[PDB]
Amino acid sequence: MWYGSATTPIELFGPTRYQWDSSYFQQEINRRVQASLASGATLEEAWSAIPEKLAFYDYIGNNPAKGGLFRTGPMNKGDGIAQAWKGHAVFRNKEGEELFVRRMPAFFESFPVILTDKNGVVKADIPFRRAESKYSFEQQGVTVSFYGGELNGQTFTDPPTVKSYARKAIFGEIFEFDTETLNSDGIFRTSPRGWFTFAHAVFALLFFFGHIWHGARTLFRDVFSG
Amino acid sequence: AIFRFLLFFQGFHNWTLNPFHMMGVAGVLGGALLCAIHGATVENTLFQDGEGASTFRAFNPTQAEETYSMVTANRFWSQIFGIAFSNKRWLHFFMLFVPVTGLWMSAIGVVGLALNLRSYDFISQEIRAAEDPEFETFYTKNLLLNEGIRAWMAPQDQPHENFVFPEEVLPRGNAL
Amino acid sequence: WAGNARLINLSGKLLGAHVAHAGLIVFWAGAMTLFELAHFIPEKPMYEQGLILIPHIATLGWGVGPGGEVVDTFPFFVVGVVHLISSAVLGFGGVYHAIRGPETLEEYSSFFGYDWKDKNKMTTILGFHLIVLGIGALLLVAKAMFFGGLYDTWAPGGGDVRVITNPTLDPRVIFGYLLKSPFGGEGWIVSVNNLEDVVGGHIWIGLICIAGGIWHILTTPFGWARRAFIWSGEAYLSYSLGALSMMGFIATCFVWFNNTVYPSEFYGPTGPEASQAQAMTFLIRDQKLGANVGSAQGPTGLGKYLMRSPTGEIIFGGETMRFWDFRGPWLEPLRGPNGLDLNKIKNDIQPWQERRAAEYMTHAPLGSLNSVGGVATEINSVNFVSPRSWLATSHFVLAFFFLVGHLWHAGRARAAAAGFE
Amino acid sequence: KLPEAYAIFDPLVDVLPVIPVLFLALAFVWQAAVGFR
Amino acid sequence: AKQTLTYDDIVGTGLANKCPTLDDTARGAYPIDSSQTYRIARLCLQPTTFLVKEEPKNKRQEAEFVPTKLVTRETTSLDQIQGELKVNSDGSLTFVEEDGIDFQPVTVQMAGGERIPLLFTVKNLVASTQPNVTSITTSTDFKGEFNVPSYRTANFLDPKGRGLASGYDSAIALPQAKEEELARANVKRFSLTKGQISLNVAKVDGRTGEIAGTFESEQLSDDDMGAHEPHEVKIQGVFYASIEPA
Amino acid sequence: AATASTEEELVNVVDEKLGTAYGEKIDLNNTNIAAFIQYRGLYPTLAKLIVKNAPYESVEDVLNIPGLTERQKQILRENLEHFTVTEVETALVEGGDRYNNGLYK
Amino acid sequence: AELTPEVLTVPLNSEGKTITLTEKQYLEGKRLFQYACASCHVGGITKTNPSLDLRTETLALATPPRDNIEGLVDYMKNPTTYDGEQEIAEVHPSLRSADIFPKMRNLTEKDLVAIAGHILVEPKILGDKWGGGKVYY
Amino acid sequence: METLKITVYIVVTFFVLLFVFGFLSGDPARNPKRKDLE
Ligand code: CLA
Ligand code: CLA
Ligand code: CLA
Ligand code: CLA
Ligand code: CLA
Ligand code: CLA
Ligand code: CLA
Numbered sequence A: 001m002w003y004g005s006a007t008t009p010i011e012l013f014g015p016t017r018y019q020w021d022s023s024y025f026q027q028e029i030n031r032r033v034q035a036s037l038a039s040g041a042t043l044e045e046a047w048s049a050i051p052e053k054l055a056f057y058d059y060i061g062n063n064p065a066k067g068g069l070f071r072t073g074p075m076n077k078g079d080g081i082a083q084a085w086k087g088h089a090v091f092r093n094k095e096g097e098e099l100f101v102r103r104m105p106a107f108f109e110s111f112p113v114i115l116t117d118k119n120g121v122v123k124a125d126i127p128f129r130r131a132e133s134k135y136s137f138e139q140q141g142v143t144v145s146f147y148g149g150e151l152n153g154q155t156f157t158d159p160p161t162v163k164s165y166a167r168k169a170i171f172g173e174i175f176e177f178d179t180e181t182l183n184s185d186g187i188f189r190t191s192p193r194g195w196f197t198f199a200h201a202v203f204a205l206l207f208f209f210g211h212i213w214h215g216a217r218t219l220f221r222d223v224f225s226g
Numbered sequence B: 001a002i003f004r005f006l007l008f009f010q011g012f013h014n015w016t017l018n019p020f021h022m023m024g025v026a027g028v029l030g031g032a033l034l035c036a037i038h039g040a041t042v043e044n045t046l047f048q049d050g051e052g053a054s055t056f057r058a059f060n061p062t063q064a065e066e067t068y069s070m071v072t073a074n075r076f077w078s079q080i081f082g083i084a085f086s087n088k089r090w091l092h093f094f095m096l097f098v099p100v101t102g103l104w105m106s107a108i109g110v111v112g113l114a115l116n117l118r119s120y121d122f123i124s125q126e127i128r129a130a131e132d133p134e135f136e137t138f139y140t141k142n143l144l145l146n147e148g149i150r151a152w153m154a155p156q157d158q159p160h161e162n163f164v165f166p167e168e169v170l171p172r173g174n175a176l
Numbered sequence C: 001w002a003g004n005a006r007l008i009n010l011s012g013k014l015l016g017a018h019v020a021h022a023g024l025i026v027f028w029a030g031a032m033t034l035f036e037l038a039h040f041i042p043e044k045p046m047y048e049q050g051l052i053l054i055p056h057i058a059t060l061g062w063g064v065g066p067g068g069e070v071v072d073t074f075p076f077f078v079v080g081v082v083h084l085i086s087s088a089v090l091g092f093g094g095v096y097h098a099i100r101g102p103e104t105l106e107e108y109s110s111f112f113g114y115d116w117k118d119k120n121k122m123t124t125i126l127g128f129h130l131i132v133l134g135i136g137a138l139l140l141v142a143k144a145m146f147f148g149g150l151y152d153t154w155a156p157g158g159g160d161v162r163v164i165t166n167p168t169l170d171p172r173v174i175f176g177y178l179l180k181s182p183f184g185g186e187g188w189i190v191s192v193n194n195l196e197d198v199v200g201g202h203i204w205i206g207l208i209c210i211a212g213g214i215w216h217i218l219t220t221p222f223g224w225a226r227r228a229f230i231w232s233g234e235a236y237l238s239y240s241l242g243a244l245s246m247m248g249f250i251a252t253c254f255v256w257f258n259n260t261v262y263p264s265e266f267y268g269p270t271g272p273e274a275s276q277a278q279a280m281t282f283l284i285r286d287q288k289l290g291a292n293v294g295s296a297q298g299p300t301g302l303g304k305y306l307m308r309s310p311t312g313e314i315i316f317g318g319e320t321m322r323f324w325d326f327r328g329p330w331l332e333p334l335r336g337p338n339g340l341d342l343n344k345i346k347n348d349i350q351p352w353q354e355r356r357a358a359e360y361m362t363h364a365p366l367g368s369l370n371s372v373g374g375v376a377t378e379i380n381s382v383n384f385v386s387p388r389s390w391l392a393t394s395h396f397v398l399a400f401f402f403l404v405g406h407l408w409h410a411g412r413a414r415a416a417a418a419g420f421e
Numbered sequence D: 001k002l003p004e005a006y007a008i009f010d011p012l013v014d015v016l017p018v019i020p021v022l023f024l025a026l027a028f029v030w031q032a033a034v035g036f037r
Numbered sequence E: 001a002k003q004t005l006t007y008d009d010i011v012g013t014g015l016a017n018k019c020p021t022l023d024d025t026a027r028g029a030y031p032i033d034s035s036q037t038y039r040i041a042r043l044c045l046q047p048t049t050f051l052v053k054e055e056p057k058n059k060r061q062e063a064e065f066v067p068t069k070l071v072t073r074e075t076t077s078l079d080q081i082q083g084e085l086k087v088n089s090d091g092s093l094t095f096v097e098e099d100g101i102d103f104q105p106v107t108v109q110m111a112g113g114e115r116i117p118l119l120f121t122v123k124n125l126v127a128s129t130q131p132n133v134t135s136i137t138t139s140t141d142f143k144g145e146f147n148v149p150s151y152r153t154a155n156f157l158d159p160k161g162r163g164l165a166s167g168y169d170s171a172i173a174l175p176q177a178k179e180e181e182l183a184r185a186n187v188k189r190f191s192l193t194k195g196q197i198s199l200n201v202a203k204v205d206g207r208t209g210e211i212a213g214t215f216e217s218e219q220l221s222d223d224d225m226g227a228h229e230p231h232e233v234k235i236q237g238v239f240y241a242s243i244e245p246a
Numbered sequence F: 001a002a003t004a005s006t007e008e009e010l011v012n013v014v015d016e017k018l019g020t021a022y023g024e025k026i027d028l029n030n031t032n033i034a035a036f037i038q039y040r041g042l043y044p045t046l047a048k049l050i051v052k053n054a055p056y057e058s059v060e061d062v063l064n065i066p067g068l069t070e071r072q073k074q075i076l077r078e079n080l081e082h083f084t085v086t087e088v089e090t091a092l093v094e095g096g097d098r099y100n101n102g103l104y105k
Numbered sequence G: 001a002e003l004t005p006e007v008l009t010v011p012l013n014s015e016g017k018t019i020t021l022t023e024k025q026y027l028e029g030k031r032l033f034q035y036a037c038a039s040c041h042v043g044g045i046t047k048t049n050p051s052l053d054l055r056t057e058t059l060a061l062a063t064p065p066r067d068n069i070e071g072l073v074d075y076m077k078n079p080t081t082y083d084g085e086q087e088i089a090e091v092h093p094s095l096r097s098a099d100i101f102p103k104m105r106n107l108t109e110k111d112l113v114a115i116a117g118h119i120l121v122e123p124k125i126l127g128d129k130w131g132g133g134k135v136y137y
Numbered sequence H: 001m002e003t004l005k006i007t008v009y010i011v012v013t014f015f016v017l018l019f020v021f022g023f024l025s026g027d028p029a030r031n032p033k034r035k036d037l038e
């Protein structure tokens, strides 16, 4: 279940933690753009091309993330009901350099919004101690421009707005959810894979005692009686 | 390298809040509580004059009855603690149940974290924790320490992702 | 191997042992005093090295000038030697009395030294040792009033050795210290501010010891005393045992919160000293940056530097608000009616005060086994551990175990009287 | 170091103060030679 | 002058908080020597009671002032100032301070248990007296204004750590949540406000001790940079004041 | 269920929004003294005074502070170029603007 | 990867001449630093005045300049406020204030030089850390 | 509340005299199960 086999397909149980740590999706997605882009299309055009389900598989909320106790735990009381786009948020600077945002590791429950350069350089961040801040978003002026699936092919400037996305960027692709239908709390939940695993592994671990109890109790009849 | 393990767990999993580790924590401390009362009760209820010299280094096979009283222990406890199931066979078995029963939980608790499935949150509280800033409980104060553990300890502790965290960015209480 | 318990009744051998371990206690007194004046370097904070007795010796103002390490080296060598030889003078004694032959059958001897279960003789032996403390105590008095003074850390300037005059001998004052709340800053014995109290507080003991030593000498215990206490040999240990425990605690806590007795100049700064020292250090720092100390508003709304105490005075704010009870020679001159005078503060603050703040604040009693100085997180390039933390730490430990001892030996005296033996 | 003329003995003085502990040690050897009783 | 009441004496029952007294001599006498020269001042400030006027049945209210119980004990009082006294072109007296003391008392309102912490301000004060210098105690007057900041400072970090100058910018525990309603709390706001205070002298004396009278001020409660709107307040008490320049 | 007049006003952090006139130069009316240390001999005494005579309407007005020395002026000129001015910000100022700011250590 | 000459080839004066220290010295630098400094200057950061460090860059901006040895030596004898307008001898260790900072009484010219060397070689080794305590903070 | 403080101390010392006088007690003293020495 957890790793995935021919019998553990995708649209049946969802994605794997191994595809998130592997940027397995980001990869295919990229190749669909350098390929089409080089064929005479505009960035706007290329993204608007890559099928969306593909981009969905990329949102982190689809990787068995968190959830020891979250009763109904359907994914939807987490994100909400997803209805969105394969939007790529391009974060450029004041000189036009394309900034790259660092993603959140399925290990952390919370991550620090940070923007890197294409070489690994640090450009923008969201300061905690604003006093001696140097890499603010306002001091360096960032900008978000969406060349993505239909839902959002435009551009943004305000620092309050721009920022929001940075965090929602950290989750990979960006989506919009019909939160209100289930009164989602906005906290992540886990897929049937995690659930099927956590159950079946514990049970199995639990049957180890069962194997050893009944075994010895079988071969020591007289000992049992004492 | 093990202590670091501990801490790691506290920051990303808040393992202490897990109930399973709690029960585990129950048996281990219960194992030691038994080990004391049993061992002390015995030693101290030992039969009088069994040794003229009055030290206690003897026994034998025929010493069927053994060196101490259940009847007195019973009353001792009954009148001091209030309870005392007096039936040697139960006392010892119960001494198997507590420690062992515990570690099985604890182990269960870990099969859970293996899947980043944790007991790291109280929706109820978090919610009212965000809609209101004049409300705080130990539940909260702790969740703060964690992030501190995570921010400062993950870039040196996990070399492969190569975390670069600018001074400002780090969470930090005033003056420290 | 209860070997030491086989000796119980043959008092002829205990003398051999009690006087053998009594020889170690003195041996250590020399081995350590000499080990110290050995490693000891002049003009470096006594406490930044790791000393303990010398500080005691300078406490008695045996060899020092106004809070000046030591002008005269020697005074310590005397102590180092004396005690190291008293260790042989007694090693001989303990050994002999242990190996050459038991006691109790010497007729003229049994007249001078009797045995157990004999209330009148035990009592008598007791009083004896009481006449000795009555003296040693009074000797301390001598060394302050008609002899080479004692070290007063208080008023004025540097408080070098000073001789006392007419100690506080008021009948009331002395026991008042006994009748006061042992809480918040006020610990009965620890509250001792004025060094003169301390002298007079010793005069009364001796008179009380002696007046008592003789008392039991001549008198055997009454009925109530006989029906409350047991009289086994093991039981007298239980009495004496638990007595020492309390005191371990006593002194420990006594150690952490200094009374002039433990001049922080040798021993170091008090746990609170450091904090309060850190507040003051920074008023100045910013005061020099033209910061107005009265209108300061810390993120809490309590003013960074100044706030109040429940009884309404002024005190350095910050967690160091819990140590406003703290009093020393440096922080006091700014003290006045209603608390700290905001006008002496920014106007009348001498420089030598910043020094002490900085030094203490700098040598915070905080340390680890690796002798790492400061916060649990510092780098190993600074070695230090306030003597106080050493005395407080080790000594606490003994006062505890020792109590475990009050329980073990006193519970075994209940087994002698009729229980298990 | 302030012993002046005795300078010569830092050594013995340095390993000196430990002996009180080593006293405990013989005690057990004393026992070993006496079969423990 | 000198009869020393040591800090040793005072630490006992809390006298600091109670301003010094002026008992018998009622000589409002103090000269026009002002017209002749200048004067400075050192003032003690203490209260007797606090008042929170909170009530929300709108359109049907005249005066709703409830008394109050002190949770923060023997704190209030403490106000040790320095201030200069000037004469204006019309014969009135004006006050201007230097140190600016302030305090943080909390009060529990009977009705809801609803605790209310006010920052007791006197900072940036400005004072006034009516007509002339020919009289003082007879006709006592002194009135001016305050400047009232916020109980909390930019550095203050709340339960989930998020304020002005430090602290997160969001509700971390709930990543994919609606930012609208939470906005209120995820952003801190700093308030600076209206101050109003008045004075009445009931005892002036000698040549050294100069004033003492009835206190009475009105400020605003703490709002927590973005929470419930402040409940209004009214404070009353006593005070002490000395003066002398030459 | 809200509007932009309310939301926008609130959706504003006083400190965040200053991140534009700030970060490129030292602000002369508010920044803690320790911001002066990054320039040649400007700290100790001038810092003390520039802070105490605030606020200023034009970066150049520093020169008018009283009791100044000849050289003092000379140095301000060379650095004048690193300063800037902006309206006083209630926050940063009513809380010891000089030392409140985390003593980094 | 060993300690090299270049590493110890430190600036001696304002103009442009340099001296290359030795192994023996370097070590005495630490030993001395720890002796009358570390306590207040642990890892090269002021405990009493956190906004002022001992990093190389910040020393050059002092008055008079201090990115070199002669400057430090001067400072250790007689102190200078970051701008050079106050005499802080009654506050900071100084051979001129031995009478108050007894730890100083013993010191010698050779030792100042070495102490100074320790402070200038360190940063080439530790880097950011010696500054505001990175590993340390 | 001063009325309260007083009430307490009475109560407290009350049960102290019962501890103290319970031990010094000429009557019960130190009476065990195996041997009574009176
Ligand atoms: C193989 C086992 C299994 C698995 C993997 C699932 C999995 C799932 N169920 Mg199903 N379920 C099962 C059996 C199972 N169920 C059974 C037998 C029934 C009864 C017919 C149901 C009834 C059911 C309902 C009614 C619903 C689900 C839902 C769900 C989804 C819930 C997500 C979640 O958050 O769960 C949360 C998991 C937990 C809270 C488990 C916590 C662990 C236990 C309680 C601890 C017990 C403590 C310990 C043992 C006692 C002390 C021991 C002592 C010795 C000391 C998930 C896909 C929901 C759904 O379909 O989503 C839309 C939903 O509404 N399930
Ligand atoms: C006032 C001092 C005092 C005295 C005179 C006695 C005397 C006696 N005790 Mg008691 N005891 C005391 C205090 C005292 N005790 C305290 C404070 C405790 C609580 C811990 C105890 C607990 C105690 C117990 C539990 C027992 C006794 C017993 C006895 C009898 C023991 C004979 C024997 O076999 O010794 C043998 C002693 C030893 C082998 C000593 C072990 C000491 C430890 C391990 C050394 C630690 C040192 C460490 C290595 C140093 C590190 C270096 C440092 C620099 C860091 C003897 C009558 C025994 C008995 O039956 O009583 C009748 C017994 O069982 N005692
Ligand atoms: C606190 C220290 C201490 C002391 C003072 C004693 C003392 C004693 N023990 Mg105990 N013992 C101790 C700790 C101690 N023990 C511990 C920790 C244990 C557990 C290991 C025991 C276990 C034990 C047992 C099992 C027995 C004793 C016995 C005895 C008694 C032996 C008498 C004798 O003549 O031996 C013979 C003497 C010697 C072999 C000589 C030793 C010589 C010393 C080292 C010389 C030092 C040099 C000297 C100072 C030079 C002076 C020169 C001059 C010019 C100054 C004696 C009273 C015995 C007994 O039955 O007593 C009733 C016994 O059987 N003990
Ligand atoms: C007559 C009363 C008497 C007196 C005064 C003492 C006094 C003392 N006892 Mg002793 N004891 C007594 C009776 C007495 N005991 C009896 C009847 C017994 C039962 C046998 C004991 C059993 C006993 C034990 C078991 C122990 C002691 C110990 C001690 C010493 C404890 C430390 C102290 O307080 O130092 C304060 C110091 C002084 C008062 C200084 C005295 C020295 C001065 C300078 C006099 C020198 C005089 C010299 C004889 C001159 C002659 C010179 C020659 C050339 C002519 C102390 C010296 C303990 C010890 O450590 O042994 C030494 C110990 O373990 N005693
Ligand atoms: C804790 C403190 C302390 C205490 C309370 C004692 C207490 C005592 N000591 Mg000790 N002592 C101590 C510390 C202490 N000492 C120390 C530290 C040392 C080492 C410096 C000594 C060294 C010491 C010695 C060397 C002696 C004592 C003796 C005595 C006892 C003297 C009583 C008396 O009246 O003698 C007055 C003396 C006499 C009445 C002597 C009579 C002489 C005998 C009977 C002669 C036998 C010879 C005969 C001709 C043989 C015929 C045989 C045939 C085959 C030919 C007394 C019990 C003495 C003792 O035990 O002997 C009785 C003794 O000689 N002590
Ligand atoms: C009566 C109690 C008593 C008290 C409270 C003190 C207190 C003090 N002494 Mg003094 N001392 C005393 C008796 C006392 N002494 C006696 C009898 C002597 C002669 C042996 C001395 C000799 C002496 C010297 C030589 C020196 C001191 C010094 C000091 C100060 C030391 C700091 C310290 O660590 O204290 C430790 C404090 C304690 C352990 C307190 C114990 C508290 C009480 C008494 C215990 C009550 C329980 C006890 C079991 C009661 C039995 C009664 C029975 C009816 C049941 C301190 C103020 C030093 C100083 O610098 O002062 C000028 C110093 O150099 N003292
Ligand atoms: C060395 C310590 C010491 C010891 C062990 C004893 C032991 C004893 N005394 Mg003695 N006593 C001593 C010193 C000592 N005394 C002194 C110095 C004096 C002079 C004042 C007296 C005066 C004295 C008298 C007048 C009487 C006794 C009696 C008794 C017996 C009382 C039974 C009992 O404890 O009842 C139970 C005990 C209590 C209710 C008291 C508990 C007290 C606490 C633990 C101590 C408080 C100490 C104090 C506050 C500290 C001083 C602090 C300092 C800073 C000033 C007992 C054998 C009686 C006796 O033997 O009758 C013939 C008796 O009538 N004693």
Ligand code: CLA
Pocket: C182, C183, C184, C185, C186, C187, C188, C189, C190, C191, C246, C249, C250, C251, C252, C253, C254, C255, C257, H012, H016, H019
């Ligand atoms: C050097 C002097 C000194 C000494 C000896 C002590 C000693 C003690 N301190 Mg104090 N302290 C001191 C200085 C000192 N302090 C200073 C300077 C400060 C300033 C900050 C403090 C602040 C302080 C605090 C804040 C506290 C203590 C506490 C304690 C006690 C802890 C042990 C215990 O649990 O007893 C339990 C009790 C006993 C063993 C009783 C002994 C009395 C007789 C023998 C028995 C009476 C029996 C009866 C059942 C009980 C009646 C008690 C009564 C209060 C109702 C101990 C008695 C703690 C405490 O419990 O307060 C009292 C505590 O919380 N201290």
Ligand SMILES: CC1=C(/C=C/C(C)=C/C=C/C(C)=C/C=C/C=C(C)/C=C/C=C(C)/C=C/C2=C(C)CCCC2(C)C)C(C)(C)CCC1
Pocket: C016, C017, C019, C020, C021, C023, C024, C027, C081, C084, C085, C087, C088, C090, C091, C092, C094, C095, C098, D006, D009, D013, D023, D024, D026, D027, D030
């Ligand atoms: C274990 C035991 C025991 C015990 C023991 C004891 C108790 C011992 C002791 C001992 C002792 C108690 C000892 C002492 C010693 C001492 C010595 C040995 C000393 C020496 C010295 C010297 C040598 C000197 C010094 C010096 C000087 C003075 C000067 C300068 C220089 C010099 C350094 C040289 C007994 C027997 C019981 C039994 C068995 C076991």
